[PDB]
Design a protein around this ligand. Structure first.
Ligand SMILES: Nc1nc2c(ncn2[C@@H]2O[C@H](COP(=O)(O)OP(=O)(O)O)[C@@H](O)[C@H]2O)c(=O)[nH]1
Ligand SMILES: [Mg+2]
Length: 185
């Protein structure tokens, strides 16, 4: 698991980690968090912090799931309050919902890319719901998000399915390694 490997890495470093999970509503974030944490971070374990923010903790690991876009407005106050202190950011996209790609691109650049606060923080993009027949490729989503324009951040886009498990732990190992090296630095 990524959950178990992250816990052991940060316990060996003798410190604490925070992982942010941002992305539009119905993208798959709560589903991925429940699955990757083998149940530990279920809906009946979420300390609710805001109208769209949920928070999880288990010893030295903390996860911050935030449903972005929609009616919710990005305020720099809310970012300091909820996401500031994160060591990695996970942007989740529903590849079978191309109608909302316009919105996911605008929120990714609003909250993460053109965010002075997010620095060398590894940003992992999950092109989720690949099992659906309408799912666009990971490269289609990368072009939709103008990732080809992201010149100053350390990112990675990996296609995955939260229902089948496909590529999930593999994408998360890239982030786990990127967090492990930069932690305490
Ligand atoms: N078929 C399929 N459905 C998914 C997948 N990921 C999430 N879903 C469904 O889409 C909904 C969105 O998940 P959830 O994490 O609760 O929404 P969010 O927290 O707003 O992203 C859930 O009810 C899941 O049943 C996937 O990979 N495949
Ligand atoms: Mg949710």
């Amino acid at each position: 698991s990524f959950f178990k490997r992250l816990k052991d890495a940060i316990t060996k470093k003798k410190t604490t980690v925070k992982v942010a999970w941002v992305g539009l509503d119905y993208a798959g974030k709560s589903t991925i968090i429940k699955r990757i944490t083998q149940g530990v971070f279920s809906d009946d374990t979420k300390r609710t912090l805001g109208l769209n923010v949920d928070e999880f903790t288990s010893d030295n690991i903390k996860f911050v799931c935030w449903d972005i876009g929609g009616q919710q407005v990005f305020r720099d106050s809310l970012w300091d309050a909820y996401i500031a202190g994160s060591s990695g950011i996970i942007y989740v996209v529903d590849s079978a919902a191309p109608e909302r790609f316009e919105e996911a691109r605008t929120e990714l650049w609003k909250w993460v890319i053109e965010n002075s606060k997010v620095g060398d923080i590894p940003i992992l993009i999950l092109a989720n719901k690949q099992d659906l027949p309408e799912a666009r490729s990971a490269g289609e989503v990368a072009r939709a998000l103008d990732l080809h324009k992201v010149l100053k951040h350390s990112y990675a886009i990996v296609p995955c399915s939260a229902a089948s498990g496909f590529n999930l732990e593999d994408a998360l190992e890239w982030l786990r390694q990127r967090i492990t090296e930069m932690i305490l630095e």
